[PDB]
Design a protein around this motif. Sequence first.
Motif, PDB file in Angstrom:
ATOM      1  N   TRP A   1       0.816  -1.200   0.000  1.00  0.00           N
ATOM      2  CA  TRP A   1       0.000   0.000   0.000  1.00  0.00           C
ATOM      3  C   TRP A   1       0.866   1.272   0.000  1.00  0.00           C
ATOM      4  O   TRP A   1       0.659   2.162  -0.822  1.00  0.00           O
ATOM      5  CB  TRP A   1      -1.077  -0.018   1.110  1.00  0.00           C
ATOM      6  CG  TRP A   1      -0.772   0.672   2.414  1.00  0.00           C
ATOM      7  CD1 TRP A   1      -0.518   0.077   3.621  1.00  0.00           C
ATOM      8  CD2 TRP A   1      -0.769   2.087   2.654  1.00  0.00           C
ATOM      9  NE1 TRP A   1      -0.336   1.039   4.588  1.00  0.00           N
ATOM     10  CE2 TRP A   1      -0.485   2.281   4.018  1.00  0.00           C
ATOM     11  CE3 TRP A   1      -0.967   3.209   1.841  1.00  0.00           C
ATOM     12  CZ2 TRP A   1      -0.399   3.553   4.584  1.00  0.00           C
ATOM     13  CZ3 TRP A   1      -0.883   4.465   2.403  1.00  0.00           C
ATOM     14  CH2 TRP A   1      -0.603   4.632   3.761  1.00  0.00           C
TER      15      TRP A   1
ATOM     16  N   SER B   1       1.192   0.319  12.086  1.00  0.00           N
ATOM     17  CA  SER B   1       0.632   1.319  12.976  1.00  0.00           C
ATOM     18  C   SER B   1       1.017   0.954  14.393  1.00  0.00           C
ATOM     19  O   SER B   1       1.350   1.796  15.224  1.00  0.00           O
ATOM     20  CB  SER B   1      -0.883   1.338  12.845  1.00  0.00           C
ATOM     21  OG  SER B   1      -1.274   1.633  11.514  1.00  0.00           O
TER      22      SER B   1
ATOM     23  N   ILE C   1      -5.926  -4.725   6.593  1.00  0.00           N
ATOM     24  CA  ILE C   1      -6.424  -3.470   7.149  1.00  0.00           C
ATOM     25  C   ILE C   1      -7.411  -2.775   6.212  1.00  0.00           C
ATOM     26  O   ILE C   1      -7.071  -2.420   5.084  1.00  0.00           O
ATOM     27  CB  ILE C   1      -5.229  -2.525   7.446  1.00  0.00           C
ATOM     28  CG1 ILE C   1      -4.628  -2.824   8.818  1.00  0.00           C
ATOM     29  CG2 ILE C   1      -5.623  -1.058   7.360  1.00  0.00           C
ATOM     30  CD1 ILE C   1      -4.285  -4.274   9.042  1.00  0.00           C
TER      31      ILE C   1
ATOM     32  N   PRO D   1      -9.974   0.453   5.217  1.00  0.00           N
ATOM     33  CA  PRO D   1     -10.062   1.893   5.362  1.00  0.00           C
ATOM     34  C   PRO D   1     -11.396   2.361   5.903  1.00  0.00           C
ATOM     35  O   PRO D   1     -11.574   3.540   6.176  1.00  0.00           O
ATOM     36  CB  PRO D   1      -9.837   2.417   3.961  1.00  0.00           C
ATOM     37  CG  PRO D   1     -10.130   1.279   3.030  1.00  0.00           C
ATOM     38  CD  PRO D   1     -10.278   0.018   3.854  1.00  0.00           C
TER      39      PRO D   1
ATOM     40  N   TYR E   1      -7.312   1.353   8.774  1.00  0.00           N
ATOM     41  CA  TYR E   1      -6.417   2.305   8.117  1.00  0.00           C
ATOM     42  C   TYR E   1      -6.599   3.719   8.641  1.00  0.00           C
ATOM     43  O   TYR E   1      -5.635   4.465   8.810  1.00  0.00           O
ATOM     44  CB  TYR E   1      -6.697   2.317   6.623  1.00  0.00           C
ATOM     45  CG  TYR E   1      -5.816   3.259   5.855  1.00  0.00           C
ATOM     46  CD1 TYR E   1      -4.560   2.875   5.425  1.00  0.00           C
ATOM     47  CD2 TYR E   1      -6.250   4.538   5.565  1.00  0.00           C
ATOM     48  CE1 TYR E   1      -3.757   3.746   4.721  1.00  0.00           C
ATOM     49  CE2 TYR E   1      -5.457   5.415   4.864  1.00  0.00           C
ATOM     50  CZ  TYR E   1      -4.211   5.017   4.441  1.00  0.00           C
ATOM     51  OH  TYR E   1      -3.421   5.891   3.734  1.00  0.00           O
TER      52      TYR E   1
ATOM     53  N   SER F   1     -10.319   6.588   4.530  1.00  0.00           N
ATOM     54  CA  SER F   1     -10.055   5.978   3.216  1.00  0.00           C
ATOM     55  C   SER F   1      -9.465   6.962   2.191  1.00  0.00           C
ATOM     56  O   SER F   1     -10.103   7.940   1.794  1.00  0.00           O
ATOM     57  CB  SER F   1     -11.310   5.284   2.647  1.00  0.00           C
ATOM     58  OG  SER F   1     -12.300   6.205   2.235  1.00  0.00           O
TER      59      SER F   1
ATOM     60  N   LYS G   1      -6.798  -1.428  -0.036  1.00  0.00           N
ATOM     61  CA  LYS G   1      -6.774  -2.828   0.433  1.00  0.00           C
ATOM     62  C   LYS G   1      -6.722  -3.813  -0.754  1.00  0.00           C
ATOM     63  O   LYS G   1      -5.934  -4.756  -0.729  1.00  0.00           O
ATOM     64  CB  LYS G   1      -7.995  -3.161   1.313  1.00  0.00           C
ATOM     65  CG  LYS G   1      -7.780  -4.355   2.230  1.00  0.00           C
ATOM     66  CD  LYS G   1      -8.932  -4.533   3.211  1.00  0.00           C
ATOM     67  CE  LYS G   1     -10.126  -5.231   2.579  1.00  0.00           C
ATOM     68  NZ  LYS G   1      -9.880  -6.683   2.372  1.00  0.00           N
TER      69      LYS G   1
ATOM     70  N   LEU H   1      -2.965  -3.982   2.071  1.00  0.00           N
ATOM     71  CA  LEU H   1      -2.584  -3.561   3.417  1.00  0.00           C
ATOM     72  C   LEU H   1      -2.483  -4.756   4.349  1.00  0.00           C
ATOM     73  O   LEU H   1      -3.486  -5.169   4.934  1.00  0.00           O
ATOM     74  CB  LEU H   1      -3.599  -2.555   3.977  1.00  0.00           C
ATOM     75  CG  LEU H   1      -3.609  -1.177   3.310  1.00  0.00           C
ATOM     76  CD1 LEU H   1      -3.993  -1.275   1.844  1.00  0.00           C
ATOM     77  CD2 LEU H   1      -4.558  -0.248   4.045  1.00  0.00           C
TER      78      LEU H   1
END
Length: 126
Positions: free
Chosen positions: A49, A58, A95, A97, A101, A105, A111, A116
């Motif tokens: 991504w 994250s 992940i 959005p 995420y 988005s 994705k 992701l």
Amino acid sequence: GAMALERPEIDFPEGQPPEYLDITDITEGDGPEAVKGSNVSMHYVGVSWSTGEEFDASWNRGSTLDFTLGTGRVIKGWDMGIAGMKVGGRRKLVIPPHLAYGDRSPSPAIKPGETLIFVVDLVGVG
């Protein structure tokens, strides 16, 4: 509070979940499994991504995330991802959005056109 929506319960009039949170359990080690009320200690690392494959999560703050799971604790799928994790085990998480995420988005639905993948390891429970 009882999780009409996935876990959080917000955005919508509650009870309208995306559910894009993709769980794939990959090994289970030490003994216990982080699930609701259990203290959580784990880490992920995201792929693609951004730059194509494994780069950073994250969750990747260098330190293991230590927080108690417990229903509506975090976003529409973080409670889902942990809830089931076993200490000393791995998982592949995709992940969304509309969830992980950013729930905002960037892409059509970052994705699929993207990819992701946040690979996770549970390393401790309470």
